Structure 1
């Protein structure tokens, strides 16, 4: 009936993910997200490197109290002589407009209302 801000989408982890070994093969860590709002929301992901890490689905439209699974694969590598404290993800979302279209749009961020965003610290466990 009245205005409705972008409900804080639940996240698990909420802000701390330690990619547990081994690093000898692409390890896809499943993430849990949920829409804690009243209406749908257009969210997108961004990582320091879109080559090594692979987040899918990168962008999508969640529903009211809808649950979705994420996949963050990490290509193999050598953590014996490589710094591991510069990897961080970004998850933002904004309430879609009245009867928005069926497709993530960039206008949803340059329109009315406010957009939320939180970076998730990455970790590497051996």
Structure 2
């Protein structure tokens, strides 16, 4: 079809997790549909074990926005890696007559898919 529009994030470059890490911390993100047509987006992390999202996917009209929540479980910054965590944002436009309900398919089918990465910075 036609390349999708951009989205806006807050933060818009990274995301910092401040210690101490001995309690489930919950940060937030603002997704904003900068685009002209609707969109479908979905999130992917690098640590299903540690991080958590919700909601993991959705539909946004244009100029519409959403607030999703990232979680971080406890852990041991001493031991684990901290340079390789990331937050992945995928989105694409929605099929000519779509319903407000995310449909995985949209990605699977032939078409264009956009990305954005939000890396996690661990602050000790």
Counterparts of 2:94 and 2:11, CA distance in 1: 25
TM-score, L = length of structure 1:
0.88
Q: Quick one: distance in 1 between partners of 2:107 and 2:77?
A: 37
Contact 1:4 1:38 in 2 (8 A): no
CA RMSD of aligned residues (A): 1.7
How far does residue 79 in structure 1 lie from its aligned partner after superposition? 1.2
1:107–1:82: structure 2 CA closer, same or farther, 3 Å change rule? closer
Deviation, structure 1 residue 115: 1.2
Q: Deviations over 1:40-98 (max 9, x none)?
A: 21111111121211111001111110111011100011213332111111100001011
Distance verdict in 2 for CA 1:37–1:112, change over 3 Å: farther
Residue 39 of structure 1 and its aligned partner are, at CA, apart by: 2.2
List alignment gaps of at least 5 residues for structure 2. Answer: none
After TM superposition, the structure 1 = structure 2 runs for residues 9-48 of structure 1, keeping only pairs within 5 Å, are: 9-48=7-46
Between 1:74-83 and 1:62-71, the stretch displaced more is 74-83
Larger mean CA deviation between 87-96 and 101-110 belongs to 101-110
Q: Over residues 9-62 of structure 1, what are the superposed CA-to-partner deviations in whole Å (9 max), with x where a residue is unaligned?
A: 101122211112221211111111100112221111111121211111001111
1:39–1:95 CA contact under 8 A, matched in 2: yes
Q: What residue ranges of structure 1 are gaps of 5+ in the alignment?
A: none
- What count of residue pairs does the alignment treat as equivalent? 124
What TM-score, normalized by structure 2, do the two folds share? 0.89
**Deviation, structure 1 residue 4:** 5.7
